[PDB]
A paper describes a structure:
Crystals with P3221 symmetry that diffracted to 3.0 Å resolution were obtained from a solution containing Nup1322–355 and Sac3757–787:Sus1B and crystals with P21 symmetry that diffracted to 2.6Å resolution were obtained with Nup1316–340 and the Sac3753–805:Sus1B:Cdc31 complex. Molecular replacement using appropriate search models derived from the Sac3CID domain complex showed clear difference density due to the Nup1 fragment, with the side chains of Phe336 and Phe338 being especially clear. For the P3221 crystals, Nup1 residues 326–340 were easily built into the difference density, albeit the Nup1 chains crossed from one Sac3:Sus1 complex in the asymmetric unit to the other in a form of domain swapping. Overall, the density of Nup1 residues 334–340 was much clearer than the remainder, consistent with residues 326–333 being bound more weakly. After iterative cycles of refinement and rebuilding, a final 2Fo-Fc map with excellent clarity was obtained. Density that could be assigned to residues 341–355 was absent from the final 2Fo-Fc and Fo-Fc maps. Vague density was visible in the place assigned to Nup1 residues 326–331 in the P21 crystal and it appears that in both crystals an additional Nup1 peptide chain became bound at this site. In both cases, the density due to this additional peptide chain was poor, consistent with it being bound weakly and/or sub-stoichiometrically and is likely the result of the peptide being present in molar excess during crystallogenesis, indicating that the binding of this second Nup1 chain was likely a crystallisation artefact. In the final model of both complexes, the structural arrangement of Sus1B bound to Sac3 and Cdc31 bound to Sac3 was essentially unaltered from that observed in the absence of Nup1 (17), consistent with Nup1 binding not generating a substantial conformational change. In both crystals, the principal Nup1 binding site was based on a cavity formed by Sus1B helices α1 and α2 and residues 757–787 of the Sac3CID domain helix.
In budding yeast, the TREX2 complex binds to NPCs and is thought to function in integrating the nuclear export of mature transcripts with earlier steps in the gene expression pathway, together with promoting genome stability through inhibiting R-loop formation (1–4). TREX2 is constructed from a Sac3 scaffold to which Thp1, Sem1, Cdc31 and two Sus1 chains bind. Sus1 and Cdc31 bind to the Sac3 centrin binding (CID) region (Sac3CID, residues 723–805) that has an unusually long α-helix about which the other three chains coil. We report here the crystal structure of the interface between TREX2 and Nup1 that shows that Nup1 residues 330–340 bind primarily to a cavity formed between the Sac3 helix (residues 757–777) and the Sus1 chain closest to Cdc31 (Sus1B) and show that Phe336Nup1 and Phe338Nup1 are crucial for this interaction.
Author numbering:
A (entry chain C): 326 to 340
B (entry chain B), G (entry chain E): 4 to 95
C (entry chain A), F (entry chain D): 756 to 786
D (entry chain X): 327 to 331
E (entry chain F): 327 to 340
H (entry chain Y): 326 to 331
Write the structure that this text describes.
């Protein structure tokens, strides 16, 4: 709720 | 730079908060269709028949069947929102 | 040209989103 | 081609 | 309570 | 050999850990 | 199976809790060495030279320098812990 | 051939 939400390793947009 | 452009997209996608929103929406929607429970029960049952259960392995048997089960409403709404974001980010 | 670019970029991002969604179900399922 | 925020 | 997943930055595969 | 296998797997995992750590500094830095 | 084995490693790496433990340790350590702040200030100035600030772009100029700044203590401790885990998982 | 044991 204070920091930015990063995608998990499962989010394979690149490679 | 083709692979470097994808970094800029992903970069701005996350920083602008659009990644959070879309991943959240897509969860909520897929959850209401019962698409989650349908895909969940398939993975669980796919895990019990085969002793060694690797993700990349079951991915090949579950993924294709799971994409089509996505309600057309949901699929189109998300695709639209993604494109709208891309349309603003990509240059003329 | 640019139209064809966004078309693929859209699908690839859409797939990433869903691919991740599967992964979270896989991992949460093994719990 | 190009990505400008 | 839940398991810690790595972020997109953890690029073990590719 | 099996010794050489783990040797590479080790370095790749160590790199992944540090690669991720960098990314988090990058993203946190733009804040 | 080479890319499929890395899937099994990462799977068990995360499920066993070793990913959590090692990343936390690695954070705490690098944070106390001031390796974070050094890499922090380094990315910032690396972003200032180039108008376009992409992670993958600066990665080629920052990554190699950051590895070496890792204290010999930390690098060996983590490498050791990683190998110890691998040694148990991989079969003979 | 390399195997993964849990």
């Amino acid at each position: 709720k204070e920091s930015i939400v990063l995608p998990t390793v499962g989010f394979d947009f690149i490679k | 730079d083709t692979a470097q452009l994808k970094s800029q997209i992903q970069q701005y996608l996350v920083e602008s908060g659009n990644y959070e929103l879309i991943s959240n929406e897509l969860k909520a929607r897929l959850l209401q269709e019962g698409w989650v429970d349908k895909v969940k029960d398939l993975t669980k049952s796919e895990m019990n028949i085969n002793e060694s259960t690797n993700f990349t392995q079951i991915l090949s048997t579950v993924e294709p069947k799971a994409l089509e089960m996505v309600s057309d409403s949901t699929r189109e709404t998300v695709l639209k929102q993604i494109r709208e974001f891309l349309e603003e980010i990509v240059d003329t | 040209s640019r139209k064809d670019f966004i078309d693929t970029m859209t699908r690839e991002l859409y797939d990433a989103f869903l691919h991740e969604r599967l992964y979270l179900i896989y991992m949460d399922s093994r719990a």
